[PDB]
Design a binder for this molecule. Structure first.
Ligand SMILES: c1ccc(Oc2ccc(-c3cc(N4CCOCC4)n[nH]3)cc2)cc1
Length: 337
């Protein structure tokens, strides 16, 4: 058998509360919103959060890339609630923060989150029109994650008791030293350090921060577009994703001991999986596009499923398939895999 409890997972990211509601076309027009696009909240969207809560159907689900990864991972290991994922981030002790913390803990995540007063809790207006979602994100409190919180006994212990470390690329936009504290911690606990490249702009605008974390990164996870901009960052003039993966194994600095893994998802095409033993492609199940609700956090759901599989000690291929299952399940919205 396996008879295995999952490894304690540490997740750090920018926590946002999805303020989610079906809205009229008039609502999008009112707020200058182009349908199906994700943008950061500007002066043009002033009042949207107060206005989306007028909708009788409005829902509040805890969100943000890394927090959704943590939620999906916990949703797979439901027998281990409070005993599996710890999430670190920065909220505010406002009403958006309470719902976020309280709805994430209830699902089984230990929320070792900071409470700042310098900004309100991070939130995302999820504007639904049929099966189309228009996103308006306000980073807020999430960006104010402090060295003080990372020193705090709660986070240090959370890290000390963890064996798997997942960081979204967005953590590098805040403060690299927070990430580098966990990088050192993964060395100490002999744990495993995983990044998600999260977005192309990370490799373009925050390349210095990424480069300081790469030697410590055991598993690099990205999609085709994130993978390609990585090659652009590295000066690898190629659009062959598998080639990029193999060079990310041996041509990107790695001082770790567990071994460098590179996972590149390719939406409709097979997931590239690379190690020091060569490149391998894991085909993604064929899907009907008239059954896709939205590709929102499909990469987050892949990463959530991939984690829960690694935490129970499944092999790398098995983890990619567990990622596929969860990704496509969340695409079409207890486990059955
Ligand atoms: C163009 C304009 C601004 C820019 O800076 C950014 C810097 C950071 C972010 C960002 C987004 C983000 N999240 C948090 C997790 O959910 C997904 C979105 N965390 N950090 C977004 C934009 C990059 C490119």
């Amino acid at each position: 058998s396996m008879a295995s409890a999952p490894l304690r997972v540490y997740v750090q990211c920018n926590p946002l509360l999805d303020v989610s509601a079906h809205v009229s076309d008039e609502f999008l027009v009112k707020y200058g919103l182009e349908r199906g696009t994700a943008i950061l909240l500007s002066e043009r969207q002033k009042g949207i959060f107060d206005d989306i809560e007028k909708m009788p159907n409005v829902r509040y689900v805890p969100g943000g890339s890394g927090l959704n990864v943590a939620r999906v991972a916990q949703w797979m290991q439901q027998a281990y609630k409070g005993k599996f994922v710890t999430y670190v981030g920065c909220i505010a002790d406002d009403r958006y923060g309470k719902v976020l913390k309280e709805a994430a803990e209830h699902e089984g995540i230990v929320m070792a989150v900071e409470h700042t007063t310098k900004a309100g809790s991070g939130a995302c207006a999820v504007c639904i029109t049929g099966k189309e979602r228009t996103l308006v994100a306000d980073l807020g409190a999430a960006n104010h994650l402090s060295s003080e919180h990372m020193r705090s006994p709660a986070v240090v212990r959370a890290m000390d008791e963890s064996r798997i470390f997942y960081f979204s690329g967005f953590t590098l936009t805040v403060d690299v030293n927070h990430v580098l504290q966990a990088c050192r911690k993964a060395r100490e606990v002999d744990g495993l350090f995983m990044i998600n490249l999260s977005a192309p702009f990370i490799m373009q605008f925050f390349s210095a921060q990424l480069g300081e974390v790469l030697p410590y990164t055991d598993i690099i996870v990205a999609n085709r577009h994130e993978a390609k901009e990585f090659a652009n960052m590295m000066k690898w003039d190629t659009d062959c994703v598998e080639e990029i993966a193999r060079r990310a194994v041996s041509e990107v600095p790695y001082t770790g001991t567990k071994g460098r893994v590179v996972v590149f998802t390719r939406d409709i095409e097979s997931t590239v999986l690379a190690t020091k033993d060569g490149v391998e492609t894991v085909p993604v199940p064929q899907l009907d596009q008239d059954k896709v609700i939205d590709m929102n956090g499909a990469g987050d759901a892949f990463m959530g499923g991939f984690l829960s599989a690694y935490a129970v000690g499944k092999d790398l291929r098995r983890c990619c398939e567990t990622g596929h299952y969860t990704a496509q399940e969340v695409i079409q919205r207890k486990p059955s895999f």
